[PDB]
Design a binder for this molecule. Structure first.
Ligand SMILES: OC(c1ccc(Cl)s1)(c1ccc(Cl)s1)[C@H]1CN2CCC1CC2
Ligand SMILES: OC(c1ccc(Cl)s1)(c1ccc(Cl)s1)[C@H]1CN2CCC1CC2
Lengths: 330, 352
């Protein structure tokens, strides 16, 4: 099946003619490349709505901000295989890494995409997941209990509180990644010694026009979560790992001149004003990351096959939401 | 011509939501929209900012709205890629009901303009550029015979009710189309042709003569409407274009087309076309020997002239199917006969 996708969609030596588990499709080591065709490709089997993700991946491939698109078919797609590794959670805090993510995020934000520019994504998704959460019934007594504790916060009332806080919080609408976590950041092989070009932002499943503060606040929230933990619930949460004001300022001091052209040419006092207001903007939007992903995770506990403690994760996001509300005095 | 109130409201919402700058804060009463192309399939509209409104950034003053089975996914990706490589109109917005694309001030070429040496040479260069494209689609040349077999299977099942359509179908069927498809298959089997990304409908109605550029000898045209595009034999794309010289679709009375076999390009006109196509396609071409260049050229004429037979066959079958399924007024059965008449005339000329 994959043999016929790689044979029919790929040029040169493939048109004549190895697979590993996502799939790593390759040509034999003794086979000589006829031209610029790839020796090793990546196959993505799935399992509007595909029209938008496809056009987006095609555009990012064309603009070199994503992996190349080699083939597109109903069952999935053939993409460029990038020799790399994903970053770990502890590396998000590294100054060079943090500064590069901010630059790669700033670049992604300035991109013009053929999608709805109305920032509906944030609240529309939260309402969609909230409507589902209130009608979910679990069979297991342990899950019924965990849900009962989450529903006890009165989620529709909390959403209206978050709505009022965010409406009185100006944040520009940009093309957001919406999932800027370590698992979506590639550390490029060989390029490890590069100070400012060793990374790549990937996996645009959630990308849309959204409030800038959500992409930044959401990334700040991601410093607290490590999804590599090998024992149940298959994640580790650490509130103390949220960026300090200094680490948050280092991130924005790299984000701002990379996004706003004039920024560098402003006065020291003016630069601090934009920055101080930006810390308020992103820390408020961090609350929407906890809320969005917390609701998402309850819906995921009901529908997903994947081995992950979804209900514990929802509780860890809701704990962080209330902790962050307290920190902000909101 | 103004659209229907429901269309005008939906169009206004798509423009204010997908288009940036002055569009984001436009009132319904400030929205300008007019029909470009009517019908039921692919309605076209020009949408615009009032002339009194200033632009804020680099947003367009006017756009084209195109108002329309996952062939929609591939078609959308194709338009996006071509828009990115500056080979098609810019894509401003994609939604289930349609697209917002760049408005290009121009007119389409007329059939008579295809023969013009400068026009012909430029079409050859843009077609050659189009063929050098790497697209993420199936590279097996299954389009041609797959489409023809698909149309033929449909044609063998067709039962018309109108007496003249019945009589016309009887004549076409009498040629023994399945047997004729096999004769065509074996002829093309012994005709080598490189598999490239083809337009597959490179006719006058899909070529834009760009406004202001009518003095630019080599850069005044643009190929558009890539709905039939796929990986196909290079022979087809060129052969199909040569067949298009014979058909004028602007005829205002039924059958809504004029066919003239004498308008097919002469060896001279074909050689002029392939003489612009070849250095545009390989770039090292001019530096080859006179005997090698003449051999490449003579093999190329034979290849495109044989594939022209598949152009006649494919559109003749498509036309019969359209007579059954389409709602658009066109003399489809007369058009099918016109393509089959040409097909047998081209067979006799090739001595095959
Ligand atoms: O998709 C996740 C999943 C976590 C657990 C799952 Cl089961 S899917 C990640 C994808 C890849 C990772 Cl590595 S973590 C997380 C990343 N963000 C979106 C959804 C999750 C919370 C925030
Ligand atoms: O699309 C057509 C149509 C003709 C009649 C129709 Cl009804 S659609 C053209 C569109 C615009 C033209 Cl100008 S010709 C023709 C161009 N090629 C594809 C189908 C037709 C034959 C070859």
């Amino acid at each position: 099946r994959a043999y016929l996708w790689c044979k029919e969609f790929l040029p040169g030596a493939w048109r004549g003619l190895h697979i590993s588990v996502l799939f790593q499709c390759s040509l034999p080591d003794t086979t000589a490349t006829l031209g610029d065709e790839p020796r090793k490709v990546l196959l993505r089997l799935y399992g509007e709505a595909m029209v938008l993700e496809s056009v987006m991946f095609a555009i990012l491939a064309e603009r070199s901000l994503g992996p190349k698109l080699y083939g597109i078919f109903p069952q999935g797609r053939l993409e460029q295989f990038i020799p790399s590794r994903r970053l770990d959670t502890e590396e998000l805090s590294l100054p060079d890494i943090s500064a590069e993510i901010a630059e790669k995020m700033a670049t992604f934000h300035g991109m013009k995409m053929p999608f709805n520019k109305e920032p509906k994504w944030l609240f529309g998704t939260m309402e969609k997941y909230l409507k589902e959460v209130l009608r979910i019934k679990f069979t297991e007594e342990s899950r019924i209990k965990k849900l009962h504790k989450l529903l006890s916060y009165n989620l529709p009332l909390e959403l209206e509180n978050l709505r009022s806080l965010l409406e009185s919080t100006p944040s520009p609408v940009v093309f957001c990644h919406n999932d800027c976590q370590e698992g979506n950041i590639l550390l490029l092989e060989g390029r490890e010694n590069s100070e400012k070009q060793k990374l790549m932002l990937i996996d645009f499943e959630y990308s849309s026009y959204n409030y800038r503060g959500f992409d930044i606040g959401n990334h700040f929230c991601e410093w607290m979560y490590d999804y590599s933990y090998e024992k149940y619930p298959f994640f580790r949460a650490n509130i103390r790992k949220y960026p300090t004001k200094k680490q948050q300022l280092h991130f924005i001091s790299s984000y701002l001149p990379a996004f706003q052209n004039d920024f560098e040419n402003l006065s020291t006092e003016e630069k601090s004003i934009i920055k101080e207001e930006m810390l308020l903007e992103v820390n408020r939007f961090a609350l929407a990351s906890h809320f969005l992903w917390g609701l998402w995770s309850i819906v995921q506990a009901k529908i997903s096959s994947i081995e992950f403690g979804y209900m514990d994760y929802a509780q860890a996001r809701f704990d962080a939401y209330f902790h962050q509300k307290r920190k902000l005095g909101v």
